[PDB]
Amino acid sequence: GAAAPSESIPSVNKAWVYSEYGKTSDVLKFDPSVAVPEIKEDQVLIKVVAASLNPVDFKRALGYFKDTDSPLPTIPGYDVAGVVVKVGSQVTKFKVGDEVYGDLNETALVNPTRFGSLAEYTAADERVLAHKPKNLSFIEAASLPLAIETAHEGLERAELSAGKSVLVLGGAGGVGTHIIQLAKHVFGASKVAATASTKKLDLLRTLGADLAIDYTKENFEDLPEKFDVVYDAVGETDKAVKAVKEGGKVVTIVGPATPPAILFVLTSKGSVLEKLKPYLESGKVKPVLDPTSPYPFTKVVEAFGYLESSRATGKVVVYPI
Ligand SMILES: NC(=O)c1ccc[n+]([C@@H]2O[C@H](COP(=O)([O-])OP(=O)(O)OC[C@H]3O[C@@H](n4cnc5c(N)ncnc54)[C@H](OP(=O)(O)O)[C@@H]3O)[C@@H](O)[C@H]2O)c1
Ligand SMILES: C/C=C1/OC(C)=C(O)C1=O
C-alpha cells in the first residue's frame, strides 16, 4: 500500500443527496458531481463498493435529530464496504489497497458525517473500520456493521453470558437476525426465543432461535416462560418488562424505555467487527440479505421505500456503487 497517485483520486463524484429534510421519496436526489470529502488525519478515503441502508438514514432525513445533525446538504448512508485509496498521516491500521468495512458514524445521532456511504468515495475514521473477511463479498460485508454492532452492544449491556436465556422482539430485521445469531453462537445462550410474523419463523430457527413466536397469533408477554435477557428491537418495552425474570435485564433500541428497560444508541467501533471476525470467517455468524438485495445505485429511492415498509428480512444493500 504505497500512496495512490494524487491525480488518480477525483475531487468530485456521484452521490445521492438531500438538501432539506423530508421523506426520501420527496427529498433524496441523485447528484452527478458532488465533492469527494477531504480526509482528516485519522481517516482513510474509501472507494465504496457497496453500502447498506438502516432506518436511521430515513429518520435522520426526516429531521428527527436536526439539533445534533451535521449541516445540510447530506449524502446519506452509514454502512460501507470498499477499498482504501488514501490514508491520513495519523493512520496506522490500514494501508492503500486494504479492503475494509464499517459504520461510518461513531455516534449515530451526534454529528454524523455530511459525506456518507451512498457515494463513489467516502472518508472514514480509522477507528470505525475493520478488515473485510476474505470469505465475505462486499455486499455481505456492507450489510453487517451498524446492525451487528447494535446486536452485540445490546447483548453486552444486558450482560448476556453462557447458559442464560434471551428473548428477542423483532428477530427478522437487520438488527434482530444478528441478535439471534450472536446470542446463540457468540454469547452461549442456552435458549433463544424470538418474535416475527408467520412466514418468517423458519428463518429465525435457521439463525439459531430455539423458539420462534408468531406475534400475529400470540402474545409473548403472556407466556409463563420468563427470560434472563429481553432485547427489544421493535419498541415494545411495556410488554418486554413483563417477560423478564427478576434480576434479569431488558434493553431496547427503540425509545422511550419503560424502566427497568434501558434504551441505548450504539457506538460504532471497528474493534467489535474485529472481535467477531472469526465467527464471520467460519460462518458461525452469517450475513443476512433481504431477497431484494442488491439494489443498483440508480435505485436508491426504491431501496429506501422498501426499507421504510418495515418488512425487510435482514439487510437492504446497494451495489454496484
Ligand atoms: N438505538 C440504536 O442504536 C439503534 C441501532 C439500530 C437500529 N435502531 C432501531 O431499531 C429498530 C430496528 O432496526 P432494524 O435495522 O433491525 O429494522 P428493519 O430491518 O427495518 O426491521 C424490519 C423487521 O422488523 C420486523 N417487525 C416489525 N414489527 C415487528 C413486531 N411488532 N414484532 C416482531 N417483528 C417485527 C419485520 O418482521 P415482520 O414482517 O415479521 O413484522 C421485519 O423483518 C428500528 O426502529 C431502528 O431505527 C436503533
Ligand atoms: C442507528 C441508530 C439509531 O438510534 C436510534 C434511537 C434509532 O432509532 C436508530 O435507528
Side-chain angles (χ1 to χ4, degrees):
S6 57
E7 287 174 19
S8 71
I9 298 174
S11 50
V12 299
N13 75 159
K14 301 167 203 189
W16 288 86
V17 179
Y18 58 97
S19 297
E20 62 183 298
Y21 289 124
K23 301 183 179 165
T24 55
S25 63
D26 290 320
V27 306
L28 194 60
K29 314 291 187 187
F30 179 76
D31 190 328
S33 193
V34 204
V36 174
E38 288 290 336
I39 62 169
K40 291 187 172 195
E41 309 159 278
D42 59 354
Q43 295 186 321
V44 304
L45 195 72
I46 297 167
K47 173 78 198 67
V48 174
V49 176
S52 105
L53 305 186
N54 286 277
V56 66
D57 290 306
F58 68 77
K59 294 181 178 183
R60 184 181 178 202
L62 283 159
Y64 287 0
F65 59 97
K66 67 178 136 177
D67 282 356
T68 53
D69 208 351
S70 52
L72 295 164
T74 305
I75 290 157
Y78 283 50
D79 285 327
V80 69
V83 185
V84 177
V85 299
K86 193 180 173 169
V87 300
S89 63
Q90 297 166 28
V91 173
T92 61
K93 301 201 174 221
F94 302 109
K95 62 187 186 306
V96 173
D98 288 348
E99 304 178 334
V100 300
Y101 75 127
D103 163 1
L104 294 169
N105 303 304
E106 180 187 320
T107 49
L109 306 184
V110 180
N111 202 34
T113 186
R114 301 189 64 232
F115 294 94
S117 60
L118 291 164
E120 298 181 271
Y121 294 85
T122 185
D125 290 347
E126 174 183 59
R127 194 172 194 173
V128 305
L129 294 175
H131 295 278
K132 188 178 73 55
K134 291 189 177 154
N135 61 303
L136 303 181
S137 70
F138 282 99
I139 287 164
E140 287 172 329
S143 82
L144 292 175
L146 197 148
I148 200 169
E149 294 177 32
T150 299
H152 182 266
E153 181 169 339
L155 292 173
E156 288 204 320
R157 287 176 176 272
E159 301 179 0
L160 187 66
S161 62
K164 292 185 182 165
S165 64
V166 51
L167 173 60
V168 179
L169 311 178
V175 181
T177 54
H178 288 304
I179 304 170
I180 293 170
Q181 293 188 90
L182 291 185
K184 200 73 193 162
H185 305 302
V186 177
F187 291 81
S190 55
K191 190 180 186 165
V192 177
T195 61
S197 62
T198 306
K199 306 180 186 170
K200 296 180 181 182
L201 306 181
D202 284 342
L203 171 68
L204 301 195
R205 303 182 185 104
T206 298
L207 295 170
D210 300 290
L211 175 57
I213 298 154
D214 187 342
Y215 74 83
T216 73
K217 292 188 191 172
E218 71 178 356
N219 302 314
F220 69 85
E221 73 277 6
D222 288 333
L223 296 167
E225 181 164 26
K226 306 296 166 196
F227 299 83
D228 298 303
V229 171
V230 188
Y231 193 151
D232 171 50
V234 177
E236 289 275 356
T237 57
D238 277 352
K239 290 172 192 228
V241 300
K242 298 181 186 190
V244 66
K245 290 166 65 182
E246 185 174 356
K249 290 210 176 325
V250 183
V251 295
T252 188
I253 56 176
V254 183
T258 296
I262 68 89
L263 166 69
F264 73 101
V265 175
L266 87 159
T267 300
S268 174
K269 303 178 164 285
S271 63
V272 172
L273 300 174
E274 296 291 354
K275 167 184 173 171
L276 295 169
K277 203 183 190 188
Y279 301 95
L280 296 168
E281 289 171 327
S282 72
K284 241 147 202 217
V285 175
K286 298 185 156 64
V288 189
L289 301 170
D290 185 276
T292 62
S293 288
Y295 292 73
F297 199 43
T298 51
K299 296 303 192 190
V300 166
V301 170
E302 290 86 353
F304 270 102
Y306 179 73
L307 184 65
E308 288 164 7
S309 78
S310 298
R311 304 282 74 82
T313 293
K315 296 293 308 189
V316 172
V317 174
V318 178
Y319 168 90
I321 292 176

